[PDB]
Amino acid sequence: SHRKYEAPRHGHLGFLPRKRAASIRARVKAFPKDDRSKPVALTSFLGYKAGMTTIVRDLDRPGSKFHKREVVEAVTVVDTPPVVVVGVVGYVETPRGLRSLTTVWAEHLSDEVKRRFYKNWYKSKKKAFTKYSAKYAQDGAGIERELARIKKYASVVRVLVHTQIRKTPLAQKKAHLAEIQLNGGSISEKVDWAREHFEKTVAVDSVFEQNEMIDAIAVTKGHGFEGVTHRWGTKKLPRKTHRGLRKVACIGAWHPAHVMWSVARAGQRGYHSRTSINHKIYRVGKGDDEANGATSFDRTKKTITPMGGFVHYGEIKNDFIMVKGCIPGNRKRIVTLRKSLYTNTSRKALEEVSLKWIDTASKFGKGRFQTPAEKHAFMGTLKKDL
Amino acid sequence: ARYGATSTNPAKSASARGSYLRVSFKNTRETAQAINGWELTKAQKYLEQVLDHQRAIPFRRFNSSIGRTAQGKEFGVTKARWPAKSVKFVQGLLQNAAANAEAKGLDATKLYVSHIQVNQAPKQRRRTYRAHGRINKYESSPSHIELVVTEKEEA
RNA sequence: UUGGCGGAAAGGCCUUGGGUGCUUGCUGGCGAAUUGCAAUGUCAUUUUGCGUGGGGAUAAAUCAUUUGUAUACGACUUAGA
RNA sequence: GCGUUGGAUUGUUCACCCACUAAUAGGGAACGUGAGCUGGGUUUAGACCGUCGUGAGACAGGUUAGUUUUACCCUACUGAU
RNA sequence: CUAUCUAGCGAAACCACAGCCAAGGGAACGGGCUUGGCAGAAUCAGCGGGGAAAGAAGACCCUGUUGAGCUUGACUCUAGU
RNA sequence: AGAACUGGUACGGACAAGGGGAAUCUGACUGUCUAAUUAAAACAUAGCAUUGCGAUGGUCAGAAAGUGAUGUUGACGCAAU
RNA sequence: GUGAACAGCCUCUAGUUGAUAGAAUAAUGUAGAUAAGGGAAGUCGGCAAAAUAGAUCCGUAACUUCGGGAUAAGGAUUGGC
RNA sequence: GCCCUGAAAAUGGAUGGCGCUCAAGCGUGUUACCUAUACUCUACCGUCAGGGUUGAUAUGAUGCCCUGACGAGUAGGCAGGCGUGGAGGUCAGUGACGAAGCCUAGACCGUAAGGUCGGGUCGAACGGCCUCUAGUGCAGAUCUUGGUGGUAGUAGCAAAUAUUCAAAUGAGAACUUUGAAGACUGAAGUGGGGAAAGGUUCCACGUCAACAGCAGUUGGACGUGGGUUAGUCGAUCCUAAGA
RNA sequence: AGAACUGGCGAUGCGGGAUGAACCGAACGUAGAGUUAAGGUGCCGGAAUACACGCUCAUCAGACACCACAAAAGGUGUUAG
RNA sequence: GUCGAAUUUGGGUAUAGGGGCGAAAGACUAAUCGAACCAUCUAGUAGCUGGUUCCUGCCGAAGUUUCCCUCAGGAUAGCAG
RNA sequence: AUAUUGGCGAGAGACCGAUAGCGAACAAGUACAGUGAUGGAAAGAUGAAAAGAACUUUGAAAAGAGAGUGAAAAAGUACGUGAAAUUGUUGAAAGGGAAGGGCAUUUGAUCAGACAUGG
Ligand SMILES: [Mg+2]
C-alpha cells in the first residue's frame, strides 16, 4: 500500500498475449525500405534450421583486450537449398492499407508445392492448378493481362517462392510457400524479373553475403502449459507455503476488483513468433563444395556436417547460411532469414570475418574427432577392419 | 401402452419400452437423441461404432465438464463421449422394436426411429459415509426408455 | 455494335455505327360512364424452395490411422492409393 | 519515461548504525494484498514475577507455552477449443 | 501418486433475483438506479482480484430492573459447634 | 592377536547408526497434568519446618442411630498446612 | 542367513496377491531425491533440511555433591585372500 | 468587468453526455415555442350534503328521482363486501344420461376479494338464498412436515510395493474357478489358537432383485437345509477386595 | 451537538433539479380536449442552430439557486470608468 | 519423550452430582463438566428479537406535556376514529 | 344426597377426517436409538368381483410388443382421483453482459357479438 521495496516487473508486456502462434511459419511483418535504384532482388529467404556448432576466428576490433586474438563462438547452421519462384502478387495502396489485386502463377508447379494445397494428398485427385495451367494455352492473354494489371496499378510487388524441401533430410514432403518482397528497382522491372523466374530457381548467395547482418523470423520452441515461475520468472515462494509455491502470492489488490492483465498467470509457454535481429553471416555454404567445413587455415577436406550427422536433423547436402550466435525456433523448423531493415554501422556490424576452424566433432556426446580419418590415425587398428 | 406424444401412423409403426432400468438418465438421454429420427440401420450401425470408439455421442445438455473429442466434429460439437451402458440398453430396445415390426410384417428396410424418449425413473438410494461422522446420499438415477420405429412414406 | 477511359471500394464512364419501339414539335378520327359523393385501386427488391431449355464443370474436408518441430483435453504439425 | 538496494539490533511500522550506489524520494489502491502465506506481536483458556487488593481477582507492566477451515459455482484474469 | 482425458459410480456447501465496467448521487465504498464505456452462440484447463463469498442470532463493547462460577466484616439466613 | 599377498585407496560398501562446543534464565533429579489448540519454568517429590491429638482424643462422615473413616491404628503414630 | 540382537534387510513352512479400472504425463500440488560458487547473507528464530553415527585402538578440558562431567573434545583403523 | 497567475493525490471519466469559441460561453433585453397526476370545460365511478316522491293507481321505500360539492396516505379507527369447515330453514335445487376434484397464453361478469361458462380428465356425491356457528383465508416467522431443483454427470472413487498369460464356466468374465508366471506378509506374520464381544456370520446345495460407493457367474449377501456328542476341558466347589 | 417560529420529510406519488427522503413546481378517483407551473427549446430530447447590444480566447477557458468549494496577492491581456 | 519401574495392562471391586475423583489442568466423572445424564414442575418469565393469512370505501396520527429505580418500558394529557 | 382424565357395560356430539384426530385408523408403545433411566416414528384407499393378464412373439432375465380380462387398464397387487415444484419428447417463438414489468401500437395466432326479408 506502497509496495515495501521496489523491483522491476517480471516479463515484457510487449510480447503478449503469450499464446500459440497462428501458423508454425512465422510471418515476415516488415520488408526493408525499397531502393528502386538497384537490381531487382529478393529481400528474404526460407530455410530449415539444422543445428549449431563452434567456430574459431581472430577478432578485428582495435581497442579491445581481444583484438588480433582468437575468440571462439557458437554458430548456427541453417539448411538452405534454392527456392523456386512460382508466382507474383501485386499490391495497391489504399486509404485502408496495402491490398492485393491479383496473383499470377506459373504454368507448372511441382508436387512439393501442390501438396501444400491439400490436407489428404494420398487420396486426392491432385486437380490443384489444372485449370489455371490452361490459361497458358492462349498465346498469352489471360496471364499476359494480369501481369499488365500489376504493372499499371501496384505499388509494391512480391514473388511467391517455395522451399525444395525434398533436398533436405526431413520426412515432411509438403514444401513451404511464402511471399517475399522484390526490392530491386521499378514496378515494371519487378514483374519482368518475376515473369522470367517463373519455375526457375533462386539461391541464397544471390540474396545474402559474408559479414551481412540479417534478421531471423521463426516460431519459437513449444513447451506446453507452464506455471507462473518458469513462464514469467516470478520468485519461488518459501518452502513453508501451504498449497504450493510456484505461484505469485498476490494476484491483485482489492480494487480494481478484477485480476488485471498485467499480473503473471499460468499458461502456454513457447510456440511464439519472434523476429530476432542482427545476426551476422559467418559463412555462405555451397552444397556442391566438398570442403564446406574447411578454411584457409584448416585445409582438410570436410563438409559442414558433424560426425554422426546433425543430431535430430541429418546431413547438409545443400547451400547453407551460417549465422553467428543463435536463432529462434528449433531443429527442423522453417525459418525466414530476412535482410536488415536498417543500415547498421556498429563496427561490430562492419567487421569482416574469416573463420579459421569449424567444429565438426560429433554433437551426440563428447565427440573427440573431426573426421573419420583423424579417428583412425589416433586409435590405430581395431578388431573390425582389415 | 400410453407413450409420449407421437404423430406417426400407428399402422405403419412398431414400438418398444423398458422401465426402471439401471442406467444413467442423463447419459442415456444424450444417446437417445443421438439417433432420433435416424433410419434404423444407420442407428444400429452407428451405435455399434460408438461402442468401438470410432464415432461418438454428442453430449448437448447434460454435459458440463465432460472432455473434448475430435469425434464431436461430425456433429458440430466439441464435447462428446462413449456411453457404453446407455448404448447397450438402447440397442436392446431397438432390437425388440425391430422384432415387433417383423411380427407386424412392416418393411425392415423402410424403418426409421420416429420416437425415442428417456425420462426419469424413481431413484434408488444407497448411503455414503462422510467426514466427521456424517452420512450422505449415494443414489441411482435410473431410466424409463420408450421408442418407436415407423415405415418412411414414399413419394 | 466501333473505339477508348476508370483499381480508393475501379464494377462504372465516355464514344462510333446502324436496327427497333415511342415521340406531347404540329393537324385529325375513336375510346373512357354504373368502380355509383372518399375508404383497399401504380409495383418496388430481397432472399428461398421448387418448373422447363441451353451452355458448363466432374472435388474435398472430417473421423479413424500416423509424426513429435505440438500438446492437460480439444488444438497444432507431419505421413499414408 | 525509468530506477530507488545489501545488512546488524527490534514482532515491530518507526527508530538506529554498517555498507554499497546514479539515487538509496514521499505516498495511495478497505491504514492494497491471510479461501495468497507467515504467526513473531496483540487479545481466550496453562504458568512465573513485580505493583495493587482482606480476598476472588486486576494491571493500557515484564515473562513462557499456546489448532490459521472451504472454491468444483459467477465474474475478472491467464491461457485453450 | 494426483490433477488431466475415458467406462462404470456419484455426493456436499451454498442459492432474494442475478452476474462487464467508469463516474455520480445514495444508509456517506452499486450487479441493478442516473450519465457514459460498451455489447455476439456454445465452451475447456487453470486462478485466487471481487461476489463487503461460505461456515453457529458477535468472542470485544454497551443496554436489560437477564444469569451463573467464584470472593468477602455486602444484605438475609443456615448444618455444626 | 599378528604377518604376507591383492584392488580405479575401496571395505560399519545395502541395512543399521550420537553432530559438537561456550554460556545466561529457569526447575535439583526420575516422575505428573489440561483425552480434542498450552508438557512448561505449572503439579509431585525426597529434604526442611510449623500445627493439632494420650482414645471420655485429634481430623473427617451421617437425617438419625446399639451408625462410620483413620483403626488389624497409638506420638519412630494419625491428622492438618 | 546376515548381525550385538525378538532391529533392519533377504528366505522356508503356512497364508495372501484384497482394497475400480484404461490412456496420457500440462500447470499447481502431496511424498521421495540432487544441485556449480558462496555458506544463514534467508527467518521472530537454522523452522525445514543437511552433516555425525557401528566396532577396534589411541586420546580426552573446566567444573564437581568425588558418584560424575565422558561416546567430552580430537584422532587412526575397518574388504578380499 | 471578462480573461491569465496564485491552483499539488492517488483505477480511466465527466458543465448529465456529445460537442460548442461574433457560442451551444458570460451580463442584459424582447418575442415565440415545449411540457405535470396542477388549472379550465365535459363523460363516468364513489363519498358526503341538500331536496323531491308509494295520494288511490305491478316488478326493489334500507328504494326511485333532482341538485351541488368533494377524492393523497403509514400507524391506526370505522364501514360495505369477497371466500372456507360445520349447523337450522328453504329451493319437492344439481347428479352415474356423470356429483366433487383437477388441467386449459378458450369465453363472460365484477374496481377488487371473486363469480360464471365451455372443452378435457374423472367417478359419488354436491350447490344457491335467509339464517347459525368457528380450530375460517399465508409469501415470509434461520416457521413445521413432506416433496423437488440449480449446483453436476461435478468433487471425487490416488495410504497399506503388483500384477501377467491361458483354459474352464457362464447370456455376459479386468474382478469366479483351475493351471502357469511374477510378487508380498517374513514367525514381533498377511501363520496357528483363544479371552471379552457377536450370535449362526461355520458347512452344503441353489443362487443375484437389493447390498459389497467399478463389476460380479463371487460373498460375512439372498433362499433352502445341515451342524456343536465329555466322570477326566470349563462352569459347578472355595475363598479375595467387597456384596 | 443543542434550542426558537413556521413550513416540510417521516406517512407522498406526480412535473423539474441527469442522479437524489427533505430544494423548485405542484399534492393524486377513471378518462377526453385545452392551458400552464417550476424547468427548458444545437443533437442526445418535446420545443427558435430565434431576435438584440456588449463582453470573453484560457499550451488548465466557461457554462445556472439548494449543489457538489476556493483565498490573500499579482498581470503593460482586453474592456468601460 | 520414556523404555525395569512413582512402569504398562486385563478382569473383579469401591466411590454418584454442590456429589465423587484430582502428583491440581477447574481436570476427569460414557464425543457431556466453572456442577453429568434422564423425566417432570413447564406452554417457566421476557420492558427484547422474529412473524402475524381476503378486497374495496371513508376518516386519519405521533415522536410532545407531567409522573415513574423513568432513559429500548409504562401511566397521564395531546393528536385520531 | 357428594367425588370420580382409573376399571366393566352402554347411549350420544353444530368434535377431527390420515401432516387432522390419542404417540398409535395398519403385525404401535411396534421398528429404531440409548450402558441406563428413557426417547420413540413412518405407515389407510386396484376392482362389484382377481376376472391378478391363458396363449404368440423378442429377450440370458427383468421385461417389451401383441392377445386376453374388465364398465374402465386414462384402474396392472408401482394400483381411486392424481395438483405444484421439478423433468423428457413434440410444436411455436424470442434471445449482441440477466430475466420479469408498465402505457401504446405493428405483425402472427386465437376468440367473439350479431339475426333477419320479400323468393
Ligand atoms: Mg449564489
Curated annotation (Swiss-Prot), chain A:
<dbReference type="GO" id="GO:0005829">
    <property type="term" value="C:cytosol"/>
</dbReference>
<dbReference type="GO" id="GO:0005737">
    <property type="term" value="C:cytoplasm"/>
</dbReference>
<keyword id="KW-0597">Phosphoprotein</keyword>
<dbReference type="GO" id="GO:0006412">
    <property type="term" value="P:translation"/>
</dbReference>
<dbReference type="GO" id="GO:0006364">
    <property type="term" value="P:rRNA processing"/>
</dbReference>
<feature type="modified residue" description="Phosphoserine">
    <location>
        <position position="296"/>
    </location>
</feature>
<feature type="cross-link" description="Glycyl lysine isopeptide (Lys-Gly) (interchain with G-Cter in ubiquitin)">
    <location>
        <position position="135"/>
    </location>
</feature>
<feature type="modified residue" description="Phosphothreonine">
    <location>
        <position position="102"/>
    </location>
</feature>
<feature type="cross-link" description="Glycyl lysine isopeptide (Lys-Gly) (interchain with G-Cter in ubiquitin)">
    <location>
        <position position="38"/>
    </location>
</feature>
<comment type="subunit">
    <text>Component of the large ribosomal subunit (LSU). Mature yeast ribosomes consist of a small (40S) and a large (60S) subunit. The 40S small subunit contains 1 molecule of ribosomal RNA (18S rRNA) and 33 different proteins (encoded by 57 genes). The large 60S subunit contains 3 rRNA molecules (25S, 5.8S and 5S rRNA) and 46 different proteins (encoded by 81 genes). uL3 forms together with ES39L one of the contact sites for the signal recognition particle that targets ribosomes to the endoplasmic reticulum membrane.</text>
</comment>
<keyword id="KW-1017">Isopeptide bond</keyword>
<dbReference type="InterPro" id="IPR009000">
    <property type="entry name" value="Transl_B-barrel_sf"/>
</dbReference>
<dbReference type="GO" id="GO:0000027">
    <property type="term" value="P:ribosomal large subunit assembly"/>
</dbReference>
<dbReference type="GO" id="GO:1990145">
    <property type="term" value="P:maintenance of translational fidelity"/>
</dbReference>
<protein>
    <recommendedName>
        <fullName>Large ribosomal subunit protein uL3</fullName>
    </recommendedName>
</protein>
<dbReference type="GO" id="GO:0003735">
    <property type="term" value="F:structural constituent of ribosome"/>
</dbReference>
<dbReference type="GO" id="GO:0022625">
    <property type="term" value="C:cytosolic large ribosomal subunit"/>
</dbReference>
<dbReference type="Pfam" id="PF00297">
    <property type="entry name" value="Ribosomal_L3"/>
</dbReference>
<feature type="modified residue" description="Phosphoserine">
    <location>
        <position position="23"/>
    </location>
</feature>
<keyword id="KW-0488">Methylation</keyword>
<comment type="similarity">
    <text>Belongs to the universal ribosomal protein uL3 family.</text>
</comment>
<dbReference type="GO" id="GO:0002181">
    <property type="term" value="P:cytoplasmic translation"/>
</dbReference>
Swiss-Prot record, chain B:
<dbReference type="GO" id="GO:0022625">
    <property type="term" value="C:cytosolic large ribosomal subunit"/>
</dbReference>
<dbReference type="GO" id="GO:0002181">
    <property type="term" value="P:cytoplasmic translation"/>
</dbReference>
<keyword id="KW-0963">Cytoplasm</keyword>
<feature type="modified residue" description="Phosphothreonine">
    <location>
        <position position="69"/>
    </location>
</feature>
<keyword id="KW-0687">Ribonucleoprotein</keyword>
<dbReference type="GO" id="GO:0000448">
    <property type="term" value="P:cleavage in ITS2 between 5.8S rRNA and LSU-rRNA of tricistronic rRNA transcript (SSU-rRNA, 5.8S rRNA, LSU-rRNA)"/>
</dbReference>
<keyword id="KW-0689">Ribosomal protein</keyword>
<comment type="function">
    <text>Component of the ribosome, a large ribonucleoprotein complex responsible for the synthesis of proteins in the cell. The small ribosomal subunit (SSU) binds messenger RNAs (mRNAs) and translates the encoded message by selecting cognate aminoacyl-transfer RNA (tRNA) molecules. The large subunit (LSU) contains the ribosomal catalytic site termed the peptidyl transferase center (PTC), which catalyzes the formation of peptide bonds, thereby polymerizing the amino acids delivered by tRNAs into a polypeptide chain.</text>
</comment>
<dbReference type="GO" id="GO:0030687">
    <property type="term" value="C:preribosome, large subunit precursor"/>
</dbReference>
<keyword id="KW-0597">Phosphoprotein</keyword>
<comment type="similarity">
    <text>Belongs to the universal ribosomal protein uL22 family.</text>
</comment>
<protein>
    <recommendedName>
        <fullName>Large ribosomal subunit protein uL22A</fullName>
    </recommendedName>
</protein>
<comment type="subunit">
    <text>Component of the large ribosomal subunit (LSU). Mature yeast ribosomes consist of a small (40S) and a large (60S) subunit. The 40S small subunit contains 1 molecule of ribosomal RNA (18S rRNA) and 33 different proteins (encoded by 57 genes). The large 60S subunit contains 3 rRNA molecules (25S, 5.8S and 5S rRNA) and 46 different proteins (encoded by 81 genes). uL22 is associated with the polypeptide exit tunnel.</text>
</comment>
<keyword id="KW-1017">Isopeptide bond</keyword>
<keyword id="KW-0832">Ubl conjugation</keyword>
<feature type="cross-link" description="Glycyl lysine isopeptide (Lys-Gly) (interchain with G-Cter in ubiquitin)">
    <location>
        <position position="45"/>
    </location>
</feature>
<dbReference type="GO" id="GO:0003735">
    <property type="term" value="F:structural constituent of ribosome"/>
</dbReference>
<dbReference type="GO" id="GO:0005829">
    <property type="term" value="C:cytosol"/>
</dbReference>
<dbReference type="GO" id="GO:0005737">
    <property type="term" value="C:cytoplasm"/>
</dbReference>
